[PDB]
Amino acid sequence: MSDQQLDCALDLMRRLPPQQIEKNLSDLIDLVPSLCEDLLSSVDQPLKIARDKVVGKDYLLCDYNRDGDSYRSPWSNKYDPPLEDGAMPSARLRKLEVEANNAFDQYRDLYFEGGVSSVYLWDLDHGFAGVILIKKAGDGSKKIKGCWDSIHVVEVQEKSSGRTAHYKLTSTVMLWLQTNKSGSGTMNLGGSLTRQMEKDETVSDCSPHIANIGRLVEDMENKIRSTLNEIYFGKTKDIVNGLRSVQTFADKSKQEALKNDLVEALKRKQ
Amino acid sequence: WXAXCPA
Amino acid sequence: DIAALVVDNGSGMCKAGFAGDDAPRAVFPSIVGRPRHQGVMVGMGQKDSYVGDEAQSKRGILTLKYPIEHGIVTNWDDMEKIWHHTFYNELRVAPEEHPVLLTEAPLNPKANREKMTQIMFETFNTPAMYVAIQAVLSLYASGRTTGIVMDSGDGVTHTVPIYEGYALPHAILRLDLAGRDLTDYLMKILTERGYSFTTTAEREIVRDIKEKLCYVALDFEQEMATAASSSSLEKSYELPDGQVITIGNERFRCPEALFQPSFLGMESCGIHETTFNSIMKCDVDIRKDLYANTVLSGGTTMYPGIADRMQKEITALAPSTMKIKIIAPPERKYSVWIGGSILASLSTFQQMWISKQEYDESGPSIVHRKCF
Amino acid sequence: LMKILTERGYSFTTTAEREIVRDIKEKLCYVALDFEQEMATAASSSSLEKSYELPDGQVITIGNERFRCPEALFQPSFLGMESCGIHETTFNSIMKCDVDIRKDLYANTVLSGGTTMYPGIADRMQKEITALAPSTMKIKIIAPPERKYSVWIGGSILASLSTFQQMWISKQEYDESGPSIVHRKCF
Amino acid sequence: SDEEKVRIAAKFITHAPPGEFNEVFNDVRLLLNNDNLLREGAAHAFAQYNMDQFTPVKIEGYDDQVLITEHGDLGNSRFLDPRNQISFKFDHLRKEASDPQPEDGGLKSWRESCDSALRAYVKDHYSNGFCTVYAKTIDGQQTIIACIESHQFQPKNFWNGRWRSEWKFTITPPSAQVVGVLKIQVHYYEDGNVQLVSHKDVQDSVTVSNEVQTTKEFIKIIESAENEYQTAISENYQTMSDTTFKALRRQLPVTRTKIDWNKILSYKIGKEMQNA
Numbered sequence A: 001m002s003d004q005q006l007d008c009a010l011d012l013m014r015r016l017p018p019q020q021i022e023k024n025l026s027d028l029i030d031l032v033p034s035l036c037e038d039l040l041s042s043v044d045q046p047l048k049i050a051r052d053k054v055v056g057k058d059y060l061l062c063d064y065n066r067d068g069d070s071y072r073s074p075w076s077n078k079y080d081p082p083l084e085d086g087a088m089p090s091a092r093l094r095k096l097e098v099e100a101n102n103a104f105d106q107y108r109d110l111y112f113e114g115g116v117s118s119v120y121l122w123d124l125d126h127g128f129a130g131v132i133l134i135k136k137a138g139d140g141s142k143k144i145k146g147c148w149d150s151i152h153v154v155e156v157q158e159k160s161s162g163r164t165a166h167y168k169l170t171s172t173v174m175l176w177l178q179t180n181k182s183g184s185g186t187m188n189l190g191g192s193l194t195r196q197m198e199k200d201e202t203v204s205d206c207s208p209h210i211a212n213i214g215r216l217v218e219d220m221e222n223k224i225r226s227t228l229n230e231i232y233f234g235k236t237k238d239i240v241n242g243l244r245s246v247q248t249f250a251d252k253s254k255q256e257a258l259k260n261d262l263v264e265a266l267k268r269k270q
Numbered sequence B: 001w002x003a004x005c006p007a
Numbered sequence C: 001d002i003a004a005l006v007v008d009n010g011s012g013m014c015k016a017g018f019a020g021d022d023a024p025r026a027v028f029p030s031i032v033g034r035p036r037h038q039g040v041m042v043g044m045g046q047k048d049s050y051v052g053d054e055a056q057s058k059r060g061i062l063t064l065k066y067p068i069e070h071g072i073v074t075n076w077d078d079m080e081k082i083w084h085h086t087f088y089n090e091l092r093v094a095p096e097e098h099p100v101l102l103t104e105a106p107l108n109p110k111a112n113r114e115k116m117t118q119i120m121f122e123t124f125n126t127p128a129m130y131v132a133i134q135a136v137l138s139l140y141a142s143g144r145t146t147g148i149v150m151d152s153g154d155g156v157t158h159t160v161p162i163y164e165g166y167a168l169p170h171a172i173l174r175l176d177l178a179g180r181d182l183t184d185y186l187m188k189i190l191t192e193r194g195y196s197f198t199t200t201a202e203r204e205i206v207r208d209i210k211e212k213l214c215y216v217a218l219d220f221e222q223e224m225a226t227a228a229s230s231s232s233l234e235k236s237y238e239l240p241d242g243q244v245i246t247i248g249n250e251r252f253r254c255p256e257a258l259f260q261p262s263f264l265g266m267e268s269c270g271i272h273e274t275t276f277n278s279i280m281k282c283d284v285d286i287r288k289d290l291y292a293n294t295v296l297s298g299g300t301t302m303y304p305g306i307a308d309r310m311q312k313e314i315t316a317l318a319p320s321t322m323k324i325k326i327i328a329p330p331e332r333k334y335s336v337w338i339g340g341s342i343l344a345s346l347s348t349f350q351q352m353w354i355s356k357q358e359y360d361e362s363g364p365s366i367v368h369r370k371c372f
Numbered sequence D: 001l002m003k004i005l006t007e008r009g010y011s012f013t014t015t016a017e018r019e020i021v022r023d024i025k026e027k028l029c030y031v032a033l034d035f036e037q038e039m040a041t042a043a044s045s046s047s048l049e050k051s052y053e054l055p056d057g058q059v060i061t062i063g064n065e066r067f068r069c070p071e072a073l074f075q076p077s078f079l080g081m082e083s084c085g086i087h088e089t090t091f092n093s094i095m096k097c098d099v100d101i102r103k104d105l106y107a108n109t110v111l112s113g114g115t116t117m118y119p120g121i122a123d124r125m126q127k128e129i130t131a132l133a134p135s136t137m138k139i140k141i142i143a144p145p146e147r148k149y150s151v152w153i154g155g156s157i158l159a160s161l162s163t164f165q166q167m168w169i170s171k172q173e174y175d176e177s178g179p180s181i182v183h184r185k186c187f
Numbered sequence E: 001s002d003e004e005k006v007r008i009a010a011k012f013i014t015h016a017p018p019g020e021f022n023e024v025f026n027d028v029r030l031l032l033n034n035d036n037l038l039r040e041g042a043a044h045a046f047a048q049y050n051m052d053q054f055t056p057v058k059i060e061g062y063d064d065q066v067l068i069t070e071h072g073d074l075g076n077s078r079f080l081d082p083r084n085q086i087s088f089k090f091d092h093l094r095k096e097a098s099d100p101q102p103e104d105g106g107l108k109s110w111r112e113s114c115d116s117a118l119r120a121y122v123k124d125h126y127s128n129g130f131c132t133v134y135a136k137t138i139d140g141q142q143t144i145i146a147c148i149e150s151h152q153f154q155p156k157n158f159w160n161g162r163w164r165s166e167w168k169f170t171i172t173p174p175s176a177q178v179v180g181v182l183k184i185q186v187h188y189y190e191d192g193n194v195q196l197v198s199h200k201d202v203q204d205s206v207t208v209s210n211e212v213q214t215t216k217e218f219i220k221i222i223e224s225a226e227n228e229y230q231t232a233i234s235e236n237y238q239t240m241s242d243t244t245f246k247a248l249r250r251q252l253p254v255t256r257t258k259i260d261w262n263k264i265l266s267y268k269i270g271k272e273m274q275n276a
């Protein structure tokens, strides 16, 4: 019954408006108390920007840089609220973590033209597994009103040959749009998506781990945004069109007659 | 150039 | 009596003939050439516009203009020359007593088809004509009543899923990337080794270099590594002035732009993702029927290795329970024309010509409610 | 110019004399704003001719030939070339740019290099590009009065940046992948 | 409190996507874990939903379905069909009509003049939609309400959709106000969730004649208005990729080519010169 409670609660979060998931998910937790730690750790959430006061760059909050009830800022490696015994990556990883925070700040700049981003890293037995977080919201004008939320989880199986590694990415994308015009009324579109993929790319000085994931993420986000544009331009367009014709469509006798003749002829020809 | 145009 | 004329007249090349044969009577490059310099020798005949194959023969002194760009006629007073040449110099028959079947790429402006039928009626005096979708006929040429046709002419591309002959108008995906963009990108990447083909005449040189040597590889990165590590993908070409050029990596970089349009400066999706979206945009009960009967067509799909590559990409995109099968006919280049000669030769199609009487009683707009 | 000057009766064919032809060019030739109107001006009354003295001391006199040389920039058909002029080149290059940014492109069209230092090239470029581009767009042909060295000035500015102190292809890096490394680092 | 927990249940239930009420209801029931509480509390929320959906239902032995609306709510879970002039008990959980009873003023002439012209508009433009003309008097003013619904559900093609619409006309001789509201919802759930929700106000005015020709003014306005709204939507989906959806994220960079992750420092230098 507990998993039957759990699988039914996850069926709710596919059948709700996506603009208020951080409200509905809290409400679902509000109704039942026994599923607190699960749904915060299983289903996705829109992110939450916190402020850095030491250097002064915005950053994002998730479960991977979280220790207790604090959060590690990647730009300073210090938890806010100030803890004196947290969880720090190695000096090997702190070299990489600033490098990946440089690259995905640059991928933030070219593609989104604004927004915030964060990278965090943690260690495995035979490799390192990370997370790439990205949020961008509306700039202030009304046709832009809505937010994009990209969350990635990478893992790396470093083979001890030192030439090739196994990369594995499980990405998800949260989206919400609202456009307003005099002719179109008020369209409040939105949604969500998830994917995964793998790759076996070589690693060297001409292609490091920063540049390897940097082709992995911007390919998957392009493969996700392209087909997400083909759900709007896909079904949610011609479903609305398939609900009346502006035109009184006639009968089709001879068109159908030609179809029949072609069918009969190709029964011999094929 | 090598093909088309001199240089 | 009279036999109906079929005229493809798509971008890049005009293919026309008599309905009932298994090959187009006349195939000629649909270009128009204007002399770029003023003649000095008289008594030998001077024309102000060479059209069709004559222009390509004398391209060394001509500015060549394609009357169609990206599937939309841009200069009608040259399209009329193209059609006049087709009717009087290649087919050699007056159009005033032969019904004609024309083709159109899907999703083209209504004004294009309107002006097309208006010209075909008022200038050439044809007794009746019809306009079919360019991709639908190619699925008739393979005898398949159902299946997804990917047509890639020299200048336009379109994927059309057709079930039981009635093509689905909600999954017809357009794509501006085609042979002409692949020629331009081939010029731009040939520039890397030092070969600069820039004039309008030399575009035909690079076009031929592409039609002959280029090929699509199965795995792009592996072939890139191969072409970088050794010289076994080097091929030599002989320009029409005797020079011998050599192309390596450029052999597959050019056509691969079909699968990654990013290479060419296009935000759109590749042809494999386009076919997969055309299969995904329709019902889930016929999505499988479409996967097993994927038909290629058009000249730009004549690259060696495009069948296996398309199959790999689609089976990687599609689920693992659907059986993929790329149907690549051996005569794709003329597939759209052949399918026409079938449709016109049907004994039940002759009640669907837009008659000149019907035209004058209803104006050109009748073409928008007679041709599907 | 070495070709069109023959119609006056001058012959420069030697590489030593190409330098004199280059000096006459960058001293007397000037782009015209309406080529046909200036042609009719020259054919109407000789008031555009100027005297130039070769290193021998001859006094040549070029008139009409002043703007026929720079005009070859806008109509490469004068040189037996098929391509379009510099104005149509800039127009097509701009219209190849993303639509959103075009609004700022038409405002910061900058001329540079030597050959753009022709007298009157600014007004001509502006007229041509604004007759090609729509009227809603703002056409600004910004012409720095020192554009002969702008490339080097920008190179110096870029080289003086601390951020650029990491973009130098180093020798030890060159030893790793051979000269082909230049294809990777440089954009 | 069980009142607030039940209040949260009404939140979730009354936002159910069109055609998915049953699937939401089973999970909300099982998560609340009390059928008695849900049978005593949520019987308001179910009615709220079946009105918000303009729920169509087949009366047994009658030629057309009827639309559940507040304009037809009689209390007692009874609803009116103004076409047959009969009311029925409605099962707000099972979507069943029962107990058809006779439910018989001066609005009748208008009720008819409009309904056949409205059923003609439905016949002309809707594939599997329905309509109703309700009529009422407000402060002595004669008020005509025209309702339209269309809904396609395909839980084997993985998408559900609805197109509701409501119109009011109030006789103000020789004129009237026209108030319209157009509402849409759609959801696609194949390997991901995408949802369209969209509402538009419409307003205009009309000049009166006899009821019959005045009706043909009303339908000609509605036809033009819904045709323009659906046209606007089709053009909007043909424009968002490069404008609105382009705003949030760019399909490709200003470079028009993927990022070269080898060169990554070079992308700073323009913005260095904005500080230089």
Ligand SMILES: Nc1ncnc2c1ncn2[C@@H]1O[C@H](COP(=O)(O)OP(=O)(O)O)[C@@H](O)[C@H]1O
Pocket (backbone or CB within 6 Å): C008, C009, C010, C011, C012, C013, C014, C152, C153, C154, C155, C179, C207, C210, C211, C212, C214, C298, C299, C300, C301, C302, C303, C304, C332, C333, C334
């Ligand atoms: N193997 C090939 N490689 C490169 N380009 C090709 C190849 N085959 C055909 N093409 C291009 O397609 C053209 C033929 O297309 P065709 O079938 O006539 O359709 P269209 O009439 O639209 O050009 C050729 O002239 C050539 O430019």
Ligand SMILES: Nc1ncnc2c1ncn2[C@@H]1O[C@H](COP(=O)(O)OP(=O)(O)O)[C@@H](O)[C@H]1O
Pocket (backbone or CB within 6 Å): D022, D025, D026, D112, D113, D114, D115, D116, D117, D118, D119, D148, D149
């Ligand atoms: N006012 C001018 N009129 C005509 N040509 C000029 C003028 N100023 C410079 N040039 C020409 O432009 C070229 C100089 O451009 P420059 O910026 O030095 O580029 P490069 O270094 O490639 O020569 C030379 O051919 C020079 O004669």
Ligand SMILES: [Mg+2]
Pocket (backbone or CB within 6 Å): C008, C010, C011, C134, C152, C153, C154, C298, C299, C336
């Ligand atoms: Mg073709």
